[PDB]
Each structure stands twice: as structure tokens, then as C-alpha cells.
A = this chain, B = another copy of it.
């Protein structure tokens, strides 16, 4: 199992979160929400396959972003 896949997953996880926040802000058009839904189903498939916690994954992503932001605010 490639690690890059795990990292890419953690990213998609954090992203999905931020997205859900964008929708909760009542700023969803229709395609973004639809994609978020289809993304959730896919996230659940990977979450089950990988059997990795999405909540903890989102946390790791947060740090992954802060690490990339630390290199360039």
C-alpha cells in the first residue's frame, strides 16, 4: 500500500471537512453539494477499505496544511 495514497486521502478528508463548512455557510450552488455527497460515499468506501478514522484523518490534514502554510503563509 503506497503511503502517498494515505496522505492524498488525509488531504481529501480535511478538504471534505472545509467543504462541509462552506455548505453549512449556506453558500452551496448545487454541483459543489452534489460533489460533496458523492465524495462522502467515496470517503466512506475508503474509510471502510483503509479502516482509518476520518475524524483523526482530518486532524492530520489540518497539520499537513499548517506545514504547507508554514513554508509560505
A68 CA to B26 CA, complexed, in Å: 12
Q: Collect the chain B residues with CB atoms within 8 Å of residue A15's CB.
A: 15, 18-19
Q: Report whether B18 and A2 are in contact in the complex, using a CB–CB cutoff of 8 Å.
A: no
A21 CA to B70 CA, complexed, in Å: 12
Q: Report whether B18 and A32 are in contact in the complex, using a CB–CB cutoff of 8 Å.
A: no
Q: For chain A, residues 38 to 52, give those with C-beta under 8 angstroms from any C-beta of chain B.
A: none
Q: How large is the interface on A (under 10, 10 to 19, 20 to 34, 35 or more residues)?
A: 20 to 34
Interface residue from B8, B19, B29 paired with A5 (Cβ < 8 Å): B29
Interface residues of A (CB under 8 A from B): 2-5, 7-8, 11-12, 15, 18-19, 21-22, 25-29, 31-32, 64-65, 68
